[PDB]
Design a protein around this ligand. Structure first.
Ligand SMILES: [Mg+2]
Ligand SMILES: [Mg+2]
Ligand SMILES: [Mg+2]
Ligand SMILES: [Mg+2]
Ligand SMILES: [Mg+2]
Ligand SMILES: [Mg+2]
Ligand SMILES: [Mg+2]
Ligand SMILES: [Mg+2]
Ligand SMILES: [Mg+2]
Ligand SMILES: [Mg+2]
Ligand SMILES: [Mg+2]
Ligand SMILES: [Mg+2]
Ligand SMILES: [Mg+2]
Ligand SMILES: [Mg+2]
Ligand SMILES: [Mg+2]
Ligand SMILES: [Mg+2]
Ligand SMILES: [Mg+2]
Ligand SMILES: [Mg+2]
Ligand SMILES: [Mg+2]
Ligand SMILES: [Mg+2]
Ligand SMILES: [Mg+2]
Ligand SMILES: [Mg+2]
Ligand SMILES: [Mg+2]
Ligand SMILES: [Mg+2]
Ligand SMILES: [Mg+2]
Ligand SMILES: [Mg+2]
Ligand SMILES: [Mg+2]
Ligand SMILES: [Mg+2]
Ligand SMILES: [Mg+2]
Ligand SMILES: [Mg+2]
Ligand SMILES: [Mg+2]
Ligand SMILES: [Mg+2]
Ligand SMILES: [Mg+2]
Ligand SMILES: [Mg+2]
Ligand SMILES: [Mg+2]
Ligand SMILES: [Mg+2]
Ligand SMILES: [Mg+2]
Ligand SMILES: [Mg+2]
Ligand SMILES: [Mg+2]
Ligand SMILES: [Mg+2]
Ligand SMILES: [Mg+2]
Ligand SMILES: [Mg+2]
Ligand SMILES: [Mg+2]
Ligand SMILES: [Mg+2]
Lengths: 59, 98, 171, 71, 108, 53, 94
RNA sequence: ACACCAUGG
RNA sequence: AGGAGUGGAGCCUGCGGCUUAAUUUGACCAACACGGGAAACCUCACCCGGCCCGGACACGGACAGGAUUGACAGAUUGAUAGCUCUUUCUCGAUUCUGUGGGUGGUGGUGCAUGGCCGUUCUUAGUUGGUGGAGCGAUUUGUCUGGUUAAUUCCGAUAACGAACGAGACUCUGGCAUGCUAACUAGUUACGCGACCCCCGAGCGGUCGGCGUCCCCCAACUUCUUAGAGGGACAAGUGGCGUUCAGCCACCCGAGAUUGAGCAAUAACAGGUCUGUGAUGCCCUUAGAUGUCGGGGCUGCACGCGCGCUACACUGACUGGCUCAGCGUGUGCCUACCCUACGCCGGCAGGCGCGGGUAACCCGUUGAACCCCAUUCGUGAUGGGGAUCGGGGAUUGCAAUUAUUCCCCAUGAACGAGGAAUUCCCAGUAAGUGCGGGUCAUAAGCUUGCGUUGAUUAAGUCCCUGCCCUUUGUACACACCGCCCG
């Protein structure tokens, strides 16, 4: 995601800009196992603000 | 005729039973969002709490278009008088918040 | 919706939520040494943590203030009742949190004190707690009708490069 | 953002004409009431509110947007 | 006239202006000719010429060139002397001419 | 009283305003920020936009 | 046609209160965006321009124009004399 | 082996 | 030294002036396609009318035959504003009157301020501790010389030991047939199966040739994705260097000098009170400077700035052919997103049914210039597309002063631009199209992306400026100074 804004309020001066950007990384894992073991292993050791989504049938 | 009596009551009973209120700084939202949504306008909530603040009874904060109002001991007493409640009952907050 | 929001909007909305909560808790716990929130969305619950220097002032009498805070945070951001759970905590080595010192100096100056005395007191404290350097500026109408600025530097201080995104705290 | 100048007519509001309070009933005898104006057959109205004696008109002040009888 | 003088109160011009009339011991005048030392020769719109002095408030902030309408405050004790209080622009001078303020002997 | 207290406001910049300052000019609508171009530059570090171009 | 209706009720009902061999007086309005239906032929209207209700006598040639297209919102300009900033040839004062 | 180059709310 | 130009023409847009009820306003290298400022309503601050209180709280006054609220009908009004007037029902202590006091303000002051930004100033510049010199302001350290893009280093040394800025640092572009591992990406293989043509030997079959035709619980990661490591260090070799710091050339190589972000002390009466529930003081506060309807911000003798399209044959027109990359996409208040495919219509566009919250659908993003063939023929012409007439659609509550789009017609200046002046060193200038921002509607703007791809330099201090040393000064508000008759 990119946002390029003017650097100043008020519209005076040399016309400089600021370029902010956010980066979103995504990974997926696929397992063939009973759902109970999936809920067993997926709900442990989630330290940072990473997302973890589980879907029951994708193959 | 600022507010029908129905509305003064329907604000004060909510402020007493919760002990706190929030309201978007909007004078055109025709219904307070879910709290008090029985045809009470957002305008009436903020105009009522304004008066309630001008006499103590309440503390007010504001950040990004939203008022936050806390009750006080004087306010607890005034609302216990005004709504004719048992002289010892308050569902707002009573627990050892461990 | 039947299909939930997209990832971009989701992350932007998370950031806006955190910013608004931090602003709200800044405007309130100033006199109690507020120094940052840590939203930790845990299984079955949304937990918010408030670091501060005077925790008794944060929770209050039997926890009236902290329960009022949970109440407002649950009313305004639309959470299902019972989800938002709030904790207070004490920050170790308060002399190195810039926001704490900034608000302390703001209230020490709002209560009447020679601005040089106050700035040198906070400089002493910040350098004594263990810190490669500090720098405190005060700008405005100090002693007159024409504005000025007064800067008190101490120790080592860097201004340029990437190592400034860490290694410095600004308030 | 400049000051206002002297007007020609300015006047705020009517003065709520002060009619006597309540003389809508008359007795032929004590406990034999008569009613000068008819009570409005309305559902929202509790059948206790009266109508204006507005000959060429019949006006119920409760239903302030409808239910007027023209005779 | 252009200069490095961005300093000083920058810009004191507007498309709006409001009139000011005569008062007690205060007349109009027309600049007859320029002298040195900030002084001036003038002519009250009725009688005497009444050599004038540009007061401390007007010095180098509002300039006065020859042959223009001005509003000067007369001195009681002295007669031939006065102090330039205000300047009248062309549109306001013609406005005064319309309201009949100045005896129309001098034109704009 | 009155029953003339609003005329249709569903679109245009009379329809929308900043989350923070409540101003109408220079809003950012991308990704659902809905935030003034000045208010953003102030809170962008809390939101999570880092400047490393 | 909203409460652009009711203007038709005073365009009409003003040509029947009028004595024959004469014209209705003025149905003065703010409604600049009215189209001209052939009913409105003949009547006199006063069409507001921002300060004044300039009057118009509707002719059968204006059918399907806008009532606003018959009272202008500004004065057609005659120029004065160019002032102090009008050219780069002009700057100096003491 | 050296053209002209004055003045400042 | 050159390239493309700009200044000349038509139009777009901003600033001055003129005009006006009003044409709201800030800003004059470092204002003028800047205030995301592409304003129909709204925005909105301007002009012209009309309702409202959303005037807390305290005190006093009137007040439950009662304070006070709201409204039907006729007149009135732009108005279906009970605005006012005639008439008199309804509400119920919430008000109303008066005195204090608050409140709001795109009201004033940016020369009262915070914060942010711009600029001095893109260069190499700055500072204190102890010691030395001077009565002192001050000075040395911070340098004769060599070197560097660099107060970068070598060295010299009344200084020693340090701090900031430079550098280091972060993102990015170039390379890995080595690692990690993938039906939300592919390759190859054949299991295949099928279509098609002999196009080859042959028969046409077997062998082959084309396939974004269908399958694999096939094997793999070359192309795609994205993580971890690797790799460049003036390291090797030859010259020039007090043989030191370093400079030039060359072999090997994906490369021997990609591009940006961040940035110091000191300062400016630079810009911003119109980003702010940042803010001091002054002003106004019910006949409002706090809301609805209408007009303006667009008006046109003229002066100026940034730009778009052209002046044609290295072209225009009409067909055919064949290649991208960076992105965005259903909205909480706020109600609208990107589109496939069938049908209908010359066209803009309409109807009907599906996919997508996205490496999944639009999409294998059939982009333009370019490439290949027709017609034109030096003629203001089939170059150019201003101005204007008539008709048809869509967005919207509303299109007139034409919002935007489509169709037939009218067919202006302009034949390379005076004095002046801007930007630029390699995947760069220029040509060319595509996305994001604003966006109910909509780019001649800006912010990013690819595609085709040159001429000219490897220098100097002449012009305009900048840095360091020596020197002169009657300047210090600092030459835009001072000053004589
Ligand atoms: Mg450094
Ligand atoms: Mg650096
Ligand atoms: Mg000179
Ligand atoms: Mg001279
Ligand atoms: Mg002189
Ligand atoms: Mg001078
Ligand atoms: Mg050109
Ligand atoms: Mg246009
Ligand atoms: Mg104008
Ligand atoms: Mg410069
Ligand atoms: Mg427009
Ligand atoms: Mg408007
Ligand atoms: Mg105020
Ligand atoms: Mg304001
Ligand atoms: Mg300033
Ligand atoms: Mg400033
Ligand atoms: Mg010393
Ligand atoms: Mg000494
Ligand atoms: Mg020195
Ligand atoms: Mg060099
Ligand atoms: Mg050395
Ligand atoms: Mg050293
Ligand atoms: Mg060598
Ligand atoms: Mg080689
Ligand atoms: Mg580099
Ligand atoms: Mg700097
Ligand atoms: Mg400001
Ligand atoms: Mg102010
Ligand atoms: Mg503005
Ligand atoms: Mg309003
Ligand atoms: Mg309006
Ligand atoms: Mg404009
Ligand atoms: Mg420009
Ligand atoms: Mg072209
Ligand atoms: Mg574009
Ligand atoms: Mg779009
Ligand atoms: Mg667009
Ligand atoms: Mg623009
Ligand atoms: Mg130049
Ligand atoms: Mg130098
Ligand atoms: Mg000297
Ligand atoms: Mg001196
Ligand atoms: Mg001189
Ligand atoms: Mg002299």
């Amino acid at each position: 995601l990119r946002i390029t804004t003017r650097k100043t309020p008020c519209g005076e001066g040399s016309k400089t800009w600021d370029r902010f950007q956010m980066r979103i990384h995504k990974r997926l894992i696929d397992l063939h196992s009973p759902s109970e073991i999936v809920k067993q292993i997926t709900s442990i050791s989630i330290e940072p603000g990473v997302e973890v989504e589980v879907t029951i049938a994708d193959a | 005729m600022l507010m029908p009596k129905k509305n003064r009551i329907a604000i004060y009973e909510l402020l007493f039973k919760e002990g706190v209120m929030v309201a978007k700084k909007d004078v055109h939202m025709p219904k307070h969002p879910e709290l008090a949504d029985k045809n009470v306008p957002n305008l009436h909530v903020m105009k009522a709490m304004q008066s309630l603040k001008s006499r103590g009874y309440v503390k007010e904060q504001f950040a990004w278009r939203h008022f936050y109002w806390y009750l006080t001991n004087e306010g607890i007493q005034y609302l216990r008088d005004y709504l004719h409640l048992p002289p010892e009952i308050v569902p707002a907050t009573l627990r050892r918040s461990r | 919706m039947a299909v939930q929001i997209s990832k971009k909007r989701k992350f932007v909305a998370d950031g806006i939520f955190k910013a608004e909560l931090n602003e709200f808790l800044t405007r309130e716990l100033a006199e109690d040494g507020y120094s940052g929130v840590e939203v930790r969305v845990t299984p079955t619950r949304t937990e918010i943590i408030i670091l501060a220097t005077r925790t008794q002032n944060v929770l209050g009498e039997k926890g009236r203030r902290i329960r009022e805070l949970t109440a407002v945070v649950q009313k305004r951001f639309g959470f299902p009742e019972g989800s938002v759970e709030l904790y207070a905590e004490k920050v170790a080595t308060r002399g190195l949190c810039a926001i704490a010192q900034a608000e302390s100096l703001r209230y020490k100056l709002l209560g009447g004190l020679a601005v040089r005395r106050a700035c040198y007191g906070v400089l002493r404290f910040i350098m004594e707690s263990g810190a490669k350097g500090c720098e405190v500026v005060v700008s405005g109408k100090l002693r007159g009708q024409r504005a000025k600025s007064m800067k008190f530097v101490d120790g080592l201080m860097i201004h340029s490069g990437d190592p400034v995104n860490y290694y410095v705290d600004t308030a | 953002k400049k000051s206002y100048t002297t007007p020609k007519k300015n006047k705020h509001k009517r003065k709520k004409v002060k009619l006597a309070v309540l003389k809508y009933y008359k007795v032929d005898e004590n406990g034999k009431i008569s009613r000068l104006r008819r009570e409005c057959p309305s559902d929202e109205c509790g059948a206790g509110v009266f109508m204006a004696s507005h000959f060429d008109r019949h006006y119920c002040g409760k239903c302030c947007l409808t239910y007027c009888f023209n005779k | 006239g252009g200069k490095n003088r961005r300093r000083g109160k920058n810009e004191n011009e507007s498309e709006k202006r409001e009139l000011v009339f005569k008062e007690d011991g205060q007349e109009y005048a027309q600049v007859i000719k320029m002298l040195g030392n900030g002084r001036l020769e003038a002519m009250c719109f009725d009688g005497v010429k009444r050599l004038c002095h540009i007061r401390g408030k007007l010095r180098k902030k509002v300039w006065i060139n020859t042959s223009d309408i001005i509003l000067v405050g007369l001195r009681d004790y002295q007669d031939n002397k006065a102090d330039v209080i205000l300047k009248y622009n062309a549109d306001e001078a013609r406005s005064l001419k319309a309201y009949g303020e100045l005896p129309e002997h001098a034109k704009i | 009283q009155q029953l003339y207290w609003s005329h249709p406001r569903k679109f245009g910049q009379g329809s929308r305003s900043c989350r923070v300052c409540s101003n109408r000019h220079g809003l950012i609508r991308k990704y659902g920020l809905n935030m003034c171009r000045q208010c953003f530059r102030q809170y962008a570090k809390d939101i999570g936009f880092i400047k490393l171009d | 046609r909203r409460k652009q209706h009711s203007l038709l009720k005073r365009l009409r009902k003003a040509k029947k209160e009028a004595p024959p061999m004469e014209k209705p007086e003025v149905v003065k309005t703010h409604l600049r965006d009215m189209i001209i239906l052939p009913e409105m032929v003949g009547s006199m209207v006063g069409v507001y321009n921002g300060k004044t209700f300039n009057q118009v006598e509707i002719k059968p040639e204006m059918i399907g124009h806008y009532l606003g297209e018959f009272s202008i919102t500004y004065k057609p300009v005659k120029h004065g004399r160019p002032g102090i900033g009008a050219t780069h040839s002009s700057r100096f004062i003491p």
